[PDB]
Each structure stands twice: as structure tokens, then as C-alpha cells.
Scaffold this active site. Sequence first.
Site, PDB file in Angstrom:
ATOM      1  N   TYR A  24       0.439  -0.937  -0.413  1.00 38.50           N
ATOM      2  CA  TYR A  24      -0.155  -0.059  -0.032  1.00 38.50           C
ATOM      3  C   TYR A  24       0.725   1.291   0.531  1.00 38.50           C
ATOM      4  O   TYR A  24       0.694   2.601  -0.604  1.00 38.50           O
ATOM      5  CB  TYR A  24      -0.914   0.144   1.142  1.00 38.50           C
ATOM      6  CG  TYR A  24      -1.890  -0.755   1.536  1.00 38.50           C
ATOM      7  CD1 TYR A  24      -2.534  -1.398  -0.072  1.00 38.50           C
ATOM      8  CD2 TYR A  24      -2.325  -2.205   1.882  1.00 38.50           C
ATOM      9  CE1 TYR A  24      -3.633  -2.461   0.140  1.00 38.50           C
ATOM     10  CE2 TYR A  24      -3.543  -2.985   2.240  1.00 38.50           C
ATOM     11  CZ  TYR A  24      -4.393  -2.826   1.243  1.00 38.50           C
ATOM     12  OH  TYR A  24      -5.452  -3.678   0.965  1.00 38.50           O
ATOM     13  N   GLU A  27     -13.099  24.528 -13.992  1.00 40.77           N
ATOM     14  CA  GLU A  27     -12.963  24.821 -15.441  1.00 40.77           C
ATOM     15  C   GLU A  27     -13.090  23.529 -16.446  1.00 40.77           C
ATOM     16  O   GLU A  27     -14.039  23.470 -17.023  1.00 40.77           O
ATOM     17  CB  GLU A  27     -12.520  26.016 -15.937  1.00 40.77           C
ATOM     18  CG  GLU A  27     -12.755  26.851 -17.090  1.00 40.77           C
ATOM     19  CD  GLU A  27     -11.570  27.514 -17.205  1.00 40.77           C
ATOM     20  OE1 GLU A  27     -11.542  28.682 -16.585  1.00 40.77           O
ATOM     21  OE2 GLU A  27     -10.955  27.907 -18.382  1.00 40.77           O
TER      22      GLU A  27
END
Lengths: 421, 440, 67
Positions: free
Chosen positions: B224, B254
Site C-alpha cells: 500500500y 473549469e
Amino acid sequence: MREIVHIQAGQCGNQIGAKFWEVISDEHGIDPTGSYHGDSDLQLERINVYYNEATGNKYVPRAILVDLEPGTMDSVRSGPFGQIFRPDNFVFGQSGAGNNWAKGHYTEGAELVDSVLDVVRKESESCDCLQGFQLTHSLGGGTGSGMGTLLISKIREEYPDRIMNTFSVVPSPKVSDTVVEPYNATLSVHQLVENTDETYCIDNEALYDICFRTLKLTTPTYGDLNHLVSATMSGVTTCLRFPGQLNADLRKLAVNMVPFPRLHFFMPGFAPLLTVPELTQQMFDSKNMMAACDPRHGRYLTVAAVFRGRMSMKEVDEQMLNVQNKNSSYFVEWIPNNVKTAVCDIPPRGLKMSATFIGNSTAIQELFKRISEQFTAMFRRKAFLHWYTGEGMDEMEFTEAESNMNDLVSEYQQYQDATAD
Amino acid sequence: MRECISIHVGQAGVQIGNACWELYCLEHGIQPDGQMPSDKTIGGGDDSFNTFFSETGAGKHVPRAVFVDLEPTVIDEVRTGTYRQLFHPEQLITGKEDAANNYARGHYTIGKEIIDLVLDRIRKLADQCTGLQGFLVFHSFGGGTGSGFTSLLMERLSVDYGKKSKLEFSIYPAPQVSTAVVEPYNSILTTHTTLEHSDCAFMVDNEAIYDICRRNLDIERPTYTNLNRLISQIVSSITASLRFDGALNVDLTEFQTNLVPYPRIHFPLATYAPVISAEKAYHEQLSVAEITNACFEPANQMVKCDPRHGKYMACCLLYRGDVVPKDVNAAIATIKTKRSIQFVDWCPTGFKVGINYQPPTVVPGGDLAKVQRAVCMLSNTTAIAEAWARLDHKFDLMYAKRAFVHWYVGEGMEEGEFSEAREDMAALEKDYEEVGVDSV
Amino acid sequence: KREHEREVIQKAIEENNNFIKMAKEKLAQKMESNKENREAHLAAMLERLQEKDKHAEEVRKNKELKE
Ligand SMILES: Nc1nc2c(ncn2[C@@H]2O[C@H](COP(=O)(O)OP(=O)(O)OP(=O)(O)O)[C@@H](O)[C@H]2O)c(=O)[nH]1
Ligand SMILES: Nc1nc2c(ncn2[C@@H]2O[C@H](COP(=O)(O)OP(=O)(O)OP(=O)(O)O)[C@@H](O)[C@H]2O)c(=O)[nH]1
Ligand SMILES: COc1ccc(CNc2c(-c3ccccc3O)nc3ccc(F)cn23)cc1
Ligand SMILES: [Ca+2]
Ligand SMILES: [Mg+2]
Ligand SMILES: [Mg+2]
């Protein structure tokens, strides 16, 4: 979720219990008075799961030692780690059970049960967050078979949202030759199917056959069988006892291994009795199963595998994929990714590399049939019922117990025949 | 202002927050104790990094974030770890007992015990904000807390904060690192109950990341720690438009206007380059054309799917470092003639570009090379529906026999929820097919 | 144009409120259906266990009243 409450009930329960505690205490660096003489912080990190912390850095098992026959108290206390157990948790009745289930479950166990339940509550109230209960016992005797299964049912009422584990020792003519062992087991199994979340089938016939053929012993003691049972019990608790990147508790086990509430009978296996591919082939081998079944006569619903030792984690991945590829038909296709694998760095005492295996296989019906057949040979000519109908029982309760276990077998068969399409 | 509050749920959420917040601290020169030498405005400010960090009067820069888990072990490691001083103790929230790989316990049983406390603490951060933009929710699909608590939280957040924007970074389960048989159920339940409440969702496929670590970083069996370090780089590329000033910096919202053509179609595919070891990056400067080209190699993607056998609805490039528009335009021209890029007939085919000058950084003792320039592509392709399909098939295999369903029903759920959720995913798969069909 | 300009903002508010409303009500609905279901499951489990206690009373009163 941390604390588990262990309960050893009857003679089998107390002897495999003592071995279990001897081994895990050794694995956590605990000595008979209960100090920590270890070295590694990993030994202590989740010691809370099985031990209480008393004054003077003294670690004390959360065990509750129960029998209807005393002297099992003396042997446990005179044994290696007898000093370590908590004196008030010994709850030993008077007159013993003499291999009767109705005495364990209905009369004699019924009196002692409340004074066990007091030790359970005392132990459960001092739990930050209790996960559940493991009961070591046998299903062949009287106390562990019958009192063991009343305790289960009574603990269930006060703690119905906590997990109920059993290490259930299943009886065989090769080890014990008491005649009514097929009655006691079938009555227990009718309780277990309803009241436990997960039962490990430690089985005396499998253990005899391993001791005999693998380990070479020409006629083995109980101590020889228990060397195996303790090795298993060490292995299927590794993920509870040590940290690992995985977090692992009794519910997470149950959720992932038990696809239908009644099919909660696991076939364990250990290896060896050395390299990673050989370990991996040995643990899926029918000779290494602590229940007396053949993986290749059914299908695995689910499997957990636990490897202990310094080894390449890459090698272990490739091998576990290997046996799934080469043995694809012996896992059900309608449960994906149904074989998982953990690795603890720390191996057990003696061995540098071990591998322990928990399987919920539909081939466990071979065990429930062998019991069913020994039972049905007796019951259909009413043999030895005065032992049971004398303590108050009906004949109905034998028919239900027999029928319930045949349904369990039938249901294990249904999901073996099931198909994805 | 334009403040952004991060919420990290369950183990995967928590451990990825560590990677991320460790990374953001190195990106902005914030020391472990929370001090930032280069910040002359003490106690507060309007600077771009203040979208993720509040300041105290003592000079401490403090993550605008909350870690939540239903068991203490993962969060306890934040409380005692390198960055323990960075977080106020009330930001780090734990219960005693986990969801046990069960959506139901995470959503109902264990979850409703801690939910008011979590919203109360989220509220305390929200009131340090002069113009809150929205939340970023990090969680696994497969965990019980990650699936069920997140769903509960998202529902509740829609109530307390209306239509305030909510982004997910969702960890999509993979067999190499999977912890539970029931992950497909948890995944389909969370996806279903979160779909009206999330505005955008970046899926990360653990397998895709696992493969990238083996292939590009030469890592034999990634942990991990290995995966999160790579993920934090991708997360950082996406949030970098929120955290940095810049002439050529296009804000993330945007990009979202372009990425989400209908409310349900809000799952962009991310692709990051370059992922390369120090060994391989030495005397090997990777130009803008090479990393741009690497964005259309599907081995560099965060989700295993094939955009080549599907249709694009948008394509955004988020560059960081030594990059100037000229090189980007030339690189895009080359790609258009030489690669498999088919848009739907209702989208314009222009690629939207943004550039941050701050070059990317690396966490000490990691596997990535420090490179002069880097790029994250965010595309909206119908191909990502492949990921829903694989997962929906695993769900169908088990659900047909009712495997494990009793564990969910016992904690209070009904069979109705399961099939209601699966039909929502059936519809979603059908939506991703419809958008790709040409008009008439 | 001004009256239309007020209808549009009123609509935007109306629908935002509606979402918040129906999410609030949908949630309370589920949490209440769940708690009734979970409690009904545990009530049945305990009622099967209390049915055993009451069968153990019949077996203990078959030894005492058959002697
Ligand atoms: N594997 C193993 N089996 C055992 C051991 N001790 C007893 N058994 C088995 O236990 C079964 C009988 O049950 P016991 O535990 O002895 O009896 P109990 O349940 O204590 O009941 P009572 O003795 O009637 O009070 C038989 O099948 C024995 O072979 C042991 O140490 N190991
Ligand atoms: N990428 C990544 N995935 C992780 C990490 N930790 C766990 N996972 C994955 O997340 C899934 C399991 O969910 P977790 O986040 O561990 O579970 P949880 O939300 O804590 O839920 P419970 O533990 O059941 O309450 C699996 O797919 C794991 O492989 C991590 O640090 N990084
Ligand atoms: C499909 O199989 C499973 C999925 C989840 C679990 C829960 N935790 C657990 C366990 C485990 C948990 C409790 C006690 C003993 C144990 O050995 N062992 C593993 C090995 C690998 C892994 F990924 C998780 N494991 C068990 C089985
Ligand atoms: Ca400032
Ligand atoms: Mg005895
Ligand atoms: Mg967790």
C-alpha cells in the site's frame, strides 16, 4: 474490536486449551508466572486479544476453564502454564458427566452454568471492545459436548451481536471406542448449526491418520494428536494475534468465509507436519487436512491461507494463483476471488516456514455422513436411549437432530452442484 | 478564499491522506511541525496554498481536512507519526469497532453512532472558511467504512451543504490486494447511493496502480505504501490547479465544465506520466511530446479499460513543471494524426490544456524519479464503463445464489436495496452506451 | 423580462430546496426502516433462544416428574 473470551470445557477442551495457551504464550514471550521476556514489539502489539494486564506488568489469559469432573483442574494447574491462569476462573463441578449429553445440556450442566456465566460477565465487562467467544471442546463426551453447547446458547442470549467461534473436536472409533459418541456429536451438531457463526472441525480420525501415516507413530497418545491441534489453533489465530498490514478479526473472518449462515463448518489444514511451492501444494493436500475429507470430492466456497516465515511475498502470490489455475474446478465459479492469503513474518517455535489453511469446502459433508452413519446404526434400534430418555429427553429431539444434520449435508450438496449460468 | 475541505474515510482514505498531505507539505515547503518559513503573512492569508491549509497565529499551517475511521489502528498511526503535530486532535476521528467489510454496518449500525460527531467537526472547518468551494472525499469502494460510511456522509453533506460541490477519489477493488469477498456488493451499494450526491468521481483501480508499480518502478510485490505514493502524485496533479498561482493555470472547476456532460456521466479516466525509476531517468530527460504521448498509452491509466475501443467526450491535459504552450500544441498535433482518438459527434474535439510552473516533487526515500516536467490527462471516455461492467458481473455471480446476503440483511438491509442498486448500475451502463451512439 | 428573471432565480432556489428536502426525507425513511428490520432480526433470534429455555424447563420437569 480487541478482546476475545476463551472457554475450555470438558477434558478435551481443557487439554487442547492448555496446549493452545502454552504455544501462544511462548509465541508472545510469556512465562508461567506471566511476565514479558521477549525482544520484539510485535509480540506485545495486540496481546490484548487474549490477555489482561494486571499489576507488575503481569499478563493473564482471558480463559474460563470449565469441567463437571475436578482433577482436570489439578492437571491444568500442575501443567507447564498452570500458574498463569486466573484462580477464580476455574469453575469445576462435582460429580462429572459420564459421557451423557442430556446431563451436560439439561440437568447437571444446567446448575453449574450460572457460575460459569458469572466468570464470563466478569471477563466480558472488563473488555474495552469484545469481539466474541471461542469454545474449545469435543463433541463426543458429556460436559464439553452438552454443557459446551448450552453455554453457547446462553452466551448467545446475553451477547447476541458478538461472534461465537468453536474449535469442535469430532469423535472417531480409532481414538476412542466409547459406543455412544455418535449420539453426542449429532446432538451437538444440531446446536452448532443454529448457534455458532464459525466452527473449526478438528477431527480425531484425521488426526489419528496423520499421526499414524505421516508422523510414523504406531499407536499415538492424546499428546501426539494435540501437538497437531495446537499447531492448527496457533495458525488460525495468527491474524488475530499479530499486527500485519491486514487487520483481521472474528467478524471479518465470518463475513468473508460464510456465504450461508448454516455452512460455517471449516476444514483446517497445516503444513508441514522447506520451500514455498511445496508448502502451497502440501496445504491443499488431503493428507494435511485436520478433518477427514478430500477437497477433490467437493468444491471450496471460500479459503483463507496463512503463511508464516521469512519468504518472498511475490513467490507466495504466484503459487496461490498456480493452485487456483491448476485446480480451478474445485472452487465454485459463482464466488470470485474466494481464496485470500496473508503472511506473518514471525514463524512458530520449531519451524522456519509454516502454512495454515482454513477452508469451507462442500466436501465437509463426508465428515457429517460418517457421523450420521454411526448414529443411524444405533438410533434405528433405540440402543442406549435410557441414558438420554432417563434424564428427561424426548425421542423427537433425536429425529430433529438427525434430520437437521442431513439437511446440512443436503445444502452442502446443493451449492456443490450449483452453476454460474 | 475558494477553500477546499478534504475528508478521508476508512483505511484507504486515511493512508492515502497521509501520502497526499505529506506530499503537499513538501510541495509548499511546510515543515512537519506546520511552520512555513516562506510565508511572511502570519495567522492568515489569501495565497493559493490557503485553499488547502489554514494558518494559526503561531505560524502553524493546518490541513483543511478530517480523517474518519470506525477503528483506531490506522488513525492512531497519524496521531503518533511524523506529521502528528500538523493536525488538530479533533480532525482525527475514530470509533472502537469497524464495519467489518459490510456496507450495512458502515452505513447504519456502527455508522450512525459517529455521524453527528463527524458533521460537527466538518462544520468547525467549514466555519473557518470565507468562501468554501466544496469537499474532496477519499475512500475505498470495497471496505465497509469506505463504502457505507462515505455513502451516509455524502447523503448528509447534501443536506447540510446543499449543492456545494463534492469530488470523490474512489479506490476500486483489485484481487492482488483485496481483503474481502464481498467487495463487489459494497461497491455497487456505495456507487448507487452516492451517484446523485457526487459531482465528479475519479476512480483509481488498484490493479492499474499495482501493474504500474511492477512495470515502471521495478517493484516486485508492491505494498500500500508503494501504491499510495503513486496515487498522491495523481491526486496532486489534479489538485495543483487549486493550490498554485499561475498565468497558464486553468482551475479544476473549469475542467469539470468540460468533463461532465450530464449529471450521471461524471467519471473521468485519469492517466499520469512519467512514472519512472531514478535508475531509468538518469541521463534520460523526457520531453513534452514523450509524456503527452504516454497519456494515450493505456498502460499508464488509473483504470483498466481501453479508450481505443470507445469514444471520447472530453480530453484535458494538466501539465506541471517546465512546459510552455508551443511544445504542448506541437505534441497534440503529432498525437492527432498518429493515434486512436475518436470523439462523439456532439462534442468539439479540442483538448483543454493547463500548466503549473511548480515542478513535481517526490517524497524522501520513494521509488519515483524527480523529473523536470509531468502531466495528468483527464478524459471522459465511454470506455470507463468497462470497469462498471467487470464489477457488475462479479456482483451478479454472487447475488444469483444470495451468497453473503444474510450478513447485510441481518444488519437491517433488504433484498430490495441490492436489486434497486444493481438496476441503477444497469441503467448507468446503458447511459454510457447511449452517449456514444451518433445523432440523427 | 424582470418578472421572468425573478421566476428563474425562484426556480433555482425551489429545486435546490427540493433536493435537500427529498434527500433528508429519503434518509430518515431508510434509517427508520433499517432500525425496525435489525431489531426484528435480533427479536426473532432472542425469541428462538427463549424458546429453548422453555424446552429445557420441560426436560427438567420430565426427570423430576417421572420418579
Ligand atoms: N484430540 C483429542 N481428543 C480428546 C482428548 N481428550 C479426550 N478426547 C476425546 O474426547 C472425546 C470424549 O470427550 P471428553 O472431552 O473426554 O469428555 P467430556 O466432554 O469432558 O465429558 P465427561 O468426561 O463425560 O465429563 C473422545 O472422542 C476422546 O477421544 C485430547 O486431548 N485430544
Ligand atoms: N490503494 C490503497 N488501497 C487500500 C489501502 N488500504 C486498503 N485498501 C483497499 O481498500 C479495500 C478495503 O477497504 P478498507 O479501506 O481497508 O476498509 P474500511 O473502509 O477501513 O472498512 P472496514 O475496515 O470494513 O470498516 C481493498 O480493496 C484494499 O486493497 C491503501 O492504503 N491504499
Ligand atoms: C476470502 O477469504 C477471506 C477474506 C477475509 C478474511 C478476514 N481476515 C483474514 C484472515 C483471518 C481472520 C480471522 C482469523 C483468522 C484468519 O486467518 N485470514 C486472512 C487471509 C487473507 C485475507 F485477505 C484476509 N484474512 C478471511 C478470509
Ligand atoms: Ca499566509
Ligand atoms: Mg471429563
Ligand atoms: Mg478498516
